[PDB]
């Protein structure tokens, strides 16, 4: 179990850690988050009390270094930093734990939610979507645009998700126009899985990362990416059976975790109705169809 200490909390802020959130008052003696499960990526995120504009946060993996948070009064945000002096860091954490000034990652033993949402998400792949090679952790916020959004403007601050475009030469083989547009299996299996992602685990990792950025930061381009990666699978007649079964589990846990009151903005009616009721895979997502019908029957 690892710890992310905070130097202090000088401004009032709602802090998230994965699917959990707590309120810290301005200058309230707060010294970080302990008991963070090892073995998963994590995200620590922020919304200031005085400007709910800009949710922002950091993806990290405690196995890759000792990380802490420190507020910067010039740039006006809580920043993640790495401490290279391991003995300094352990000494800092032990003192903060002795004074009991940290919140405990509040995981229920029965509960696999976070594993289920991050099963295929790897830090190394996050760092290729979010390019800032001098840091071991990755910053994301509400406003960052994707490479594909930038084609339709600062490249260093972009989300480099894999571009998916159903009316593109990459997606459509010359001479197979109708076939490839109506059945996207060659684009899914040959172009994307064999060619770009290499395997379905990397595809699911990017899909899951896109969903989490949409949910935690309201990042619109991430929501677009999540839906495009669902639609590409659902619109393929030929999908390995293990991928369909895994997709059903992935989406089930995403829909289960989504705040009921954000469904209007985070769920695309057209994609979901097409995927569950019209697509080739309309009968392959039983768990997802059941939770959607019981939790969001309005959208459908």
């Amino acid at each position: 179990m690892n710890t992310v200490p905070f130097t202090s909390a000088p401004i009032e802020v709602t802090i998230g850690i994965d699917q959990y959130s707590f309120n810290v008052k301005e200058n309230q003696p707060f010294h970080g988050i302990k008991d963070i499960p090892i073995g998963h990526v994590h995200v620590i995120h922020f919304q200031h009390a005085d400007n709910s504009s800009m949710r922002y946060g950091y993806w990290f993996d405690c196995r890759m270094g000792n990380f802490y948070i420190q507020y910067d009064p010039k740039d006006g945000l809580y920043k993640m930093m790495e401490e290279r002096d391991g003995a300094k860091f352990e000494n800092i954490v032990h003192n903060f734990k002795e004074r009991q000034m940290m919140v405990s990652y509040p995981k229920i033993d029965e509960d696999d939610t976070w594993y289920n949402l991050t099963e295929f998400v790897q830090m190394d792949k996050i760092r290729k979507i979010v390019r800032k090679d001098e840091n071991q952790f990755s910053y994301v916020d509400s406003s960052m645009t994707t490479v594909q959004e930038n084609e339709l403007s600062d490249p260093a601050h972009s989300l480099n998700y894999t571009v998916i475009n159903f009316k593109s030469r990459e997606a459509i083989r010359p001479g197979h126009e109708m076939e490839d547009f109506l059945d996207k299996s060659y684009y899914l299996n040959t172009v994307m899985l064999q060619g770009i992602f290499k395997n379905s685990s990397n595809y699911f990792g990017e899909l899951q990362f896109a969903f989490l950025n949409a949910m935690f930061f309201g990042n619109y381009g991430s929501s677009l990416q999540w839906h495009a990666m669902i639609e590409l699978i659902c619109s393929s007649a030929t999908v390995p059976k293990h991928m369909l079964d895994k997709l059903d589990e992935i989406l089930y846990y995403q829909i289960k975790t989504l705040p009921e009151q954000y469904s209007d903005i985070l769920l695309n009616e057209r994609v979901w109705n097409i995927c569950l009721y019209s697509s080739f895979q309309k009968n392959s997502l039983h768990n997802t169809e059941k939770i959607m019908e019981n939790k969001y029957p309005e959208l459908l």
Binding site: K167, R169, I172, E177, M178, F181
Partner: protein
Amino acid sequence: GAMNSSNYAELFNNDIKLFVDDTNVYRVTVHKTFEGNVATKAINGCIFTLNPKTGHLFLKIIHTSVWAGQKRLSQLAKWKTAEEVSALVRSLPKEEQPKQIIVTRKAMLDPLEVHMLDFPNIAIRPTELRLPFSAAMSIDKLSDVVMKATEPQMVLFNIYDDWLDRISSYTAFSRLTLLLRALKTNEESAKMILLSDPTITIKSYHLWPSFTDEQWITIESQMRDLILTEYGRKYNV
């Protein structure tokens, strides 16, 4: 975006454009089977691809053999249309290729866009105009070449005959759309109007009769009357 009454003069500017109408591509007769079920029999069809500025019509005849052994023919017909329009564009010299292609039915947008990916600078546009190009098969010479075809064939016509020697392309298109709207609303009456008088003939190299300017005014008035007539007979007004 979409072509409508507001941007109507754009049709007659000097940017090459084509209308594509697919309503006569897949044509069937519905009939009873010996067991009392219903079946369809396809008949030859055509793509109607028209330059509204010059009157040049590229009539691609769709022979019934293209449907043999195929499923979902109404969907296939849109893709076959888009395949043939793309092939036509590729066949034309670069300086003759269109800048825009306007489809008369919105269901042609995605098929045509996908077939024209190699031409990113050709705009594929819908229209809000309800153009009467389905009535092309009421022009006797067009219907004749389609029905007689024994294989796929492209035939080139000028749908304006020689009108552009005397009138502008705006006026020629307005005459064409009026004639076609009339043929669509009451084919029998429209054709009676066009041929009632035996002394006005259709030249061998023309589609419509050789009316003088004054006779075209009478004709056009008779077509408007017919369209209004039928509009009453219909709605009881």
